Every structure is written in structure tokens, then in C-alpha cells.
Amino acid sequence: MNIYTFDFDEIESQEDFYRDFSQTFGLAKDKVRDLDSLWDVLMNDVLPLPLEIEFVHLGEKTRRRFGALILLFDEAEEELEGHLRFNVRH
Template sequence: METISFDFDRIGTEKDFYTTAARQLKLPEHFGSNLDALWDVLTGHISLPVKIDFINLTMSQLETFSDVIAVFEDAAGELGDGFVFNYSLKGL
């Protein structure tokens, strides 16, 4: 299973996240950089099986990116064992 890590020491804004996601997940150029487009690519574009880790999240980032985290959690529920998602707070 491929593991893809998003290091939130290097992600500060939504724009940073979507730029990183496009690169890390090898998304097409026409990726829409929004929650609906994110859902579409997670559930229909990326190669499975995959494990995705969000690391070094601060409490502030946990709040800022809560909708993004929810999309990844929903995708994990939808796709089952082929899609694993975890996140961890910085310092824990």
C-alpha cells in the first residue's frame, strides 16, 4: 500500500493544501481546488490502495482544515480497506 504524507509544517493555507494535494496525489491540471473536486478525485481518480497521513497539524490547523479532514474521513468510509486516512497533531 502506498503511503502519502501531508506535512502541515509546510502547509499553512487552503491554497497551500490544494497545491500540495495536486502534486502528492498526481491530480490532473483541471483539478478544481475545492471540497467537491477533492471528493471526486479521492473517490474516483487516485490509485488504490493508499494510506494518507496528515502530520504535524496544530490545533489551529485542525480547525482550519476540518472540512478537508471530513472529506478524507468520508472517503475512507466510502472506499473501505483500500483507503486509509489518519491525522496527527504536532507534538503528540
């Protein structure tokens, strides 16, 4: 139900993501710094579920560079019985 968007025209490293993510969900300092900490927050009922995460303006190469993130989010969706929706642009 809550829709959040990540515009990759403004994200260039995974580090940029973690910060934009924390900023978007009002999370503290470094509650999310790497993949494992991102995964915990997705697993520990911390987010405003049900929600949808939209990855936008992500092209070929960038999709590939951020593949770990895309993998993590498809799995969170698989694990959160659709309470979390993840979509990459087109």
C-alpha cells in the same frame, strides 16, 4: 499500501493543500481546486488505491481550521471500504 504524507508545517491555507495534493498525485492543473473537486477525485478511482493519507504536524488550531478537509477524508475512508486510509499524526 501506498503511503503519502502531508506535512502541515508547510501548508497554511486549503489552497496550499489542493496544490500539494495535485503535485503529490501527479494530477493536472486544477483537477482539484475546492472540496467538490477533491471529493470527485476521491470518488472516481483516479488515485493509486489502496493508499494511506497521513496528515502530519497538525496541532489544535490548525486541525480546526482544516476541519472540512479532515471531515472529507474520514468520509472518503468510510466510503472506500478501507481501501483509503486516513490518519492525522498523533
